[model samples]
Target chain A: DKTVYVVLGGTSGIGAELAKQLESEHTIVHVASRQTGLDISDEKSVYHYFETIGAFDHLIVTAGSYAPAGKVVDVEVTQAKYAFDTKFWGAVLAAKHGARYLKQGGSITLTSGMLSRKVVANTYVKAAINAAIEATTKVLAKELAPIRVNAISPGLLPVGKVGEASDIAMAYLFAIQNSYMTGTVIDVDGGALLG
Target chain B: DKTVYVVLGGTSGIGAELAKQLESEHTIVHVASRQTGLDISDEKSVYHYFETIGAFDHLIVTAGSYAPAGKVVDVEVTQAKYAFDTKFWGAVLAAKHGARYLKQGGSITLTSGMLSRKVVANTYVKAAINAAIEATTKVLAKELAPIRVNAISPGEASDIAMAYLFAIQNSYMTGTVIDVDGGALL
Candidate 1:
């Protein structure tokens, strides 16, 4: 029942805390993120991180940034790329490289947002990339079996809202225990995000 | 309770048959397609056809062609764009234009394939468009509300297959996924 847990982009925000909580319950926690100098947008960094971490039980990521809010008309390709690079491609690479380390029944859980499902005035780029991730989550769950892949679609997980973390952690724990929950996305938002 | 049903690409294949079946049921049928010279891919054609056709009860489309399947390295971008332009954009434009004429609770059903869910060796372009269409379907379903939008994910349905004809008719009853392949996908 031994499992190695790796949290990419675990230095701050939700991932940072997830790493701490998981480290106490699990054996090892390998953290990667901007603060840790792991540029997840670059494939090389993802590969290098996985190589060092070796085999793992779970891979969690909250590493991504998008343009500050702006009108869809003003948004440029580059602005969208900032979030798309990390949010979508980063998850893609993590699954690509991280798949090798997962023992049978292992899992990969990452983060997406309400933007994945909803479109905001200035959040079109974020929505596009997040939607791509949500779709990819389903695609990978089917591709990577025995090692389930799921995502947390946290809605309006308010600033300083630690309670929401506990709610979302259930999805991670569920992925760990349940074998049939692949390709599913758990929205941890307290309902405001759906609006 | 009579309503106009427009089936673009309705001269042959699944679309043509659906039109005939709808007509038999006493609903007015507007068959628009390349054969009918109402090009869905063209703006003016779409506008002109719908203007004359008037309001619709259902707008059904089962037409799109993609570049031959191939590896991403082997597939040309133009080929990819052509598929996207025809298959993806065609569906989007159809939904956009049809919304104007569709009655309340009217539904628009678009057709996609299994490749949207599974990767095929030489069908990246097709898969890409199918995936986009599925996403569009989900989004539009929410957008249209009482006027519903959905897609049918069919497996390899043969042209002459007797079961294929019944699947679209069944679609009216079952909502999405008429699935005429004798459960090939399952």
Candidate 2:
């Protein structure tokens, strides 16, 4: 039996690494992203991508852009909201549409970061987006049920030494393999949040 | 000296109640709301409201609408965003502008709800909003400095409550969350 996994935004970065790692025996990985024509922001193409892809055992969305630059007070109000446009809204839309095509007992994983809980000046935009996704993951886990929903909040942007894409990829792997890990945020922040 | 306080969305609701309670022998309260022509969601109106109100000792933003109705799954994306447009952005914009006018050591208080931690099923929109605002509170409290920042999380809005009053009065308490849920969260 083949395990089908769909990795949205899997063309590069940690997503690409995840897609690469999932190439083990009896596993099929389909990389779908803006580079692959499935823009997460476009509600139409997102739904259509899943509708066309048919069935998949797992869905992981790692495809959003970096947070808007500059502090909240200095950032243009319109610009400040850009973070929500791509990262926050994108994942919600993806899960809403993609959840329909996820096979029974499958799972959905989203990407968040450490900023949500790690308070830093000028990072409120990123913090809010991450916090929102974690909250979304919990509710969706209940609403979608048995089809588990979770998020991986990486400390990729470190407080000191760097973290690896390879390491971040492992978090996604664990989320997929662990059936009981629903409505949770897996942090690979290397202890940065302990402060 | 009259202690000047400005209540955004103070024409009604908890803010209206707070405005009445804040009245005293040496107090001045100015209420700004959409009903009074200050639309918190409109950046121009928000900034101008603070500019016109001039310097104030305390600023409280209770000026926002209820969360978007319907579950996140069933709620249209635009409708879901309505929560942020007014409530989240409104509170942020109010602080961003009003922070410029506060007397040193003056405080900024925000309204959040028990939904952030009181997690009930299918309340994701409200949950995300309250959580985000609480997060925003701590960061801004640090960023704004000396000009205190805090939030009030209520499960039940109460006979109104003591959180906001305490937030305004407590000089050393900044970046804190006052749970006036009255054990509803328990």
Candidate 3:
């Protein structure tokens, strides 16, 4: 029941909300963000934070920049990279380092958007990024055995708005409680991504 | 239009059949395989043949060995690798070299099996290989632009004699994996 929990990019948005919910139950809750001088895009900063903070029982990341709205022709490649770095690669680095710090039965969770499957304007790159994250989850689930890795693909769990925080966190519960599941991107999008 | 055609492992089987069908309508058919002293699993052999043979209009591959029938745990890592080497990576190498030789509007077509989506008793590794091939097909379709990439997911096509009678080829089929298995996916 007593275990350290960490939420990256917890200063604002859903991550911040998630941290607050865990504040009541977990042994410890640590939130990291740019304001906290821990940019996930930076390796040294991420490594230092994990190394100094030591091991964790759970690590959840809700960090990703939204892609611009437009068609593929209108979208800038550089702008696309911005979202890719934050959501896709950012999740990669977290899992890579998170695995190193998870306790014997620890778990790591990631947040992927609905556009992963529900393609909208100017979101080709985002879709690709989401697929890559899901594929990586499958690879790591097998690669990093014992310590499970999974991503929560949420839909319309609107930012700063009252939505199901408990439902979202239940994914972490399944990941940790159910030993059989790993490397899965649990779609909690109310089937929004199916569009 | 007169376009060069290359068929990997075209001596017999589906590749040979497709090549023979294409010959009367299109350009010269360049067959490459062990019979031609071209080993697809061997990089040097693949590279050397392409060096001598040069580019083409269309590159179709029905080559690669299917893995031994069994569950994932029941199969040997080496057998899986052999399947991967010939079936998965071999096709990849063909596309890689095909790009260099193909003119604009050139297309690459690969042959996969029904196991890509349907997993039966002894299709664990077979399904994995086919699925990976489909994934790679989509990625390469985008990467190899101006040139198209595609795969055909054949369901029991090899042994089914009558299925060949219904064979039809079409353009606008790029980036897709047509299930030529008589609605098995359904």
Candidate 4:
């Protein structure tokens, strides 16, 4: 039997690397992004896109724009809202629409970052957005049973430390293959939260 | 010197309780909400309201509607965003403008719920919004000095009111979220 995976924002970055590792004789990976005609921010777009994809085994959403720069006071409220349209709301839309076609046993993996728990000034919006996704990850796992839902909270490396997309992509694979994991947010960050 | 306090969404509930505790002969409390011509959801309204107030001592924002009822999958994604526009974004705007008029030693008190850390079904939106405000609270404290910033994450009921009083009266606490629940970690 073949396993089909739909990776949102899979056109590049960690998602691109995920596809490379996921594709095999027994696996099928479908990569989609804005370039691939799926804008995760649009409900209609997400609703229609999932309709096109028949049955899927796993869903991964890595699509979302970075929050605008500046302290909460320095930035306009709109600056904060713009990122939510894509990264925050986009994930919710993906989970709702992607759920319909996901195989009962199939798992969903979302993207969060180390900043959610750590203090990073001028990144308040990102921290909130990241935490929001992690929260959504847990709730969906509870509501949508048997269908596993988890998120990858990526890390920030020291100036001297080297990091790559492939490293975190491996976590995504672990989330899919492991049956015991659900309602979890795996910290892929190498001790970033501790510091 | 006379101290002025602006309590947003202070017309009733926990905010009303806070006003009852805070008002004094030396302290003047101006309670405002949509009823009093201040709508925290509108940036322009918040900005203008602060400009007219001249200067104030503390700011507490409890002025937001609850998250629409439903689990993440059962509700429209818009339901999630709608609550953020008020509860999350409103706090930000209030802090931005309200900071301009807040006295150097004054504090800002925001309302979060126990749900921020404790998980409850069908309340994913509220949990995220609560966490967002909590995160914002710490950062604002770091960014705005002398004028302290903090949040009150109430657990369930009556004991919730005193948390706001402690936040305003304590000078040593800043960038902290005071959880006033009985036994559970909030």
Candidate 5:
């Protein structure tokens, strides 16, 4: 059976990398982003995009900002909130609108980061955002049911320095193809937490 | 040095029971609740009460509602949000203002439940609330350093529950949620 996959942040970085990987499968892959005239953060856009694309088998969201770096006190409240625009709020919006278009046995996969577990100075907002995503993953799994919801938390890697987008892409694919893997946060951080 | 402890919602149940156990230590125990003119769900009340009582050694919050029994489809969004008013939001307000009054070596211990790990029907909101609290516990521990933050998810903390409460209060550990559910989670 032919599969349909939607990559929300397929314009660049991991989203783009994941889009490329999925293309090889000969599945119907729709790469949505600002470049594609779709903004995941905007609820209306998310709804319209999914509505236009119709039903899909899997949804992978690689759209999100880098882990914010700055002292908690020094961080502006507006900036901190905006940091969630792409990753947290965007993912929430996606799940809200995108869920309707998901076919039976489909899955929703989101992105998180290692900062959630391993904290560093000036990354408070990033840590919180990542933590929120992981928490959301659990709730969505239960709420969405049989549709499956999971996340990927990538650690620093030598090949990719911060992380190889391709390496992170593999996790997204794993989540999409695997059956019975719900509410799971796959930490793909090249053993950064091993220490 | 004498220890000072505050128990929110101490007028009943686990909070009340825990208060009695602390009294045996001869430590100063102050129980705050609606009867005491302090409403945890109200932010102002929490701030004012802590300001009046001044600093303390440990803080235990057993103030929360039970796992709301209802299907998610039939669940009222407002009602669900209000459910968190006492357990989740109330705890946040307490830590926000109450953290300042925490004495050196003091710890903030909140309550969570077994429903977080194991899911049952009609507990969708309850599970989410518990998970959020546990997640907040980790962030708060990192954000509020030196001062430890932990939680207790009692399955049925009647006998050995208070013992675990005191142990967590005095323990040096931070950002940990000790489950005293009698291996119910297993």
Candidate 6:
């Protein structure tokens, strides 16, 4: 009774690490990303990717770009929209299409950043996008009832951190396996906000 | 000196009531909305509208439409986009344009909803939009520096409840204010 999982943005970074951690016995992980011709930002690509995958037990979307930090007055609107395309709209597209293929007990996990709660100068847009993703995660949890949905808000890790990826992957694994949890944003920032 | 206040979507709902309550001996309130040819959803229109308003003491954006409740799978993408165009992007445009005309010590209050915190069936987009606006408020408060930014989530605020909002807005507070009442504060 191994579970099947789809890890978007699984080609690199946290996504890659998550794929590695979830690759043990009783699990089959399909890592999808831009390199695999699956662009979450593009509606058609997301649909095609989900349609091809058929049904899965869980979905972990960690696909996003580094939004440029700048003052609202000084920020380029085009660049901000580009960041939204990947972070905000991309998540929306994934949830919209991915939910169609999720089984009853499956879940969807999105990535929100610490900035959503703690404000920083010149990162207004990024904060907004993360907030939207977290909100969407909750709403999707309600909309896609019986099928859990959650988000992970990660904080800055120390330099030369090796197990950070494995640490984050556990959050995704927990959200998928835990049937009692839904619509929660688990902060994995290692107390960055408290400091 | 008379403190000038601008209330977007001030023609009706909580905005209208807020405008009436805030009008006082030392306050001059200008209520703006679609009725005044100022559409917050339209970026150029928001810019032009703010350009005419030289300097304002406070900006309260209570403008938002009723997002139709429907399941996410059944919800039309176009309709959801339309809602965001007004609720989310409109507020962004207002803050982007309105911040220019706000003097030091001024504040901006955007409207969010309780649904942002408590989820309900068929209210996904509205929740997301409200959450985004609240987040934007805090971020803008930091980016704008001396100018304060906050958000209000009106739950069961009666008509007489606006006085409490005015008090909080005029106070030295800048963040999300939910269910402001005298008894609660006391």
Candidate 4, residue B163: the lDDT equals 83
Task: List candidate 6 stretches off by more than 4 Å.
Answer: A157-163, B24-26, B156-169, B180-186
Per-residue C-alpha lDDT of model 3 across residues B123-159, encoded as one tens digit per residue = 5456656765665566566666656777777773343
| Candidate 4: Cα lDDT at B11 | 86
Residue A72 Cα positional deviation in candidate 4, in Å, after optimal superposition: 1.0
Against the true structure, whose DockQ is highest?
A: 4
Model 2, B1-186: lDDT tens per residue? 689999988888888888988989899999989889998988988888888888889989887666665555677888778878888899888888888889877998988888777657778888888888898898888898888999988773435546788899889999998888768888
Question: Could you give candidate 1's per-residue lDDT for residues B54-90 as a string of tens digits?
Answer: 7777887776854655543344444555565567666
lDDT of each: 0.65, 0.85, 0.67, 0.86, 0.76, 0.81
TM-score of each: 0.56, 0.95, 0.57, 0.96, 0.78, 0.90
Across A10-116, the per-residue lDDT of candidate 4 in tens digits comes to 99989999999998999888999999888889999989988888888999998885788787778877868989889989998999888889887899999998888
Best by TM-score: 4
Whichever of 5 and 6 has more lDDT, that candidate is 6
Which parts of model 1 have CA positions greater than 4 angstroms off? A67-74, A119-122, A157-163, A192-195, B1-186
lDDT of 2 by residue, A108-162 (tens): 9999989889988888888888888888788888788878999999884235667
Clashing pairs in 2: none
Stretches > 4 Å off in candidate 3 = A119-121, A157-167, B1-168, B171-186
Q: Model 5, B17-44: lDDT tens per residue?
A: 8888788555888998878898888877
lDDT of 5 at A44: 73
Better of 1 and 2 by DockQ: 2
TM-score of 5: 0.78
- In candidate 2, position A16 carries an lDDT of 94
lDDT ranking, best first: 4, 2, 6, 5, 3, 1
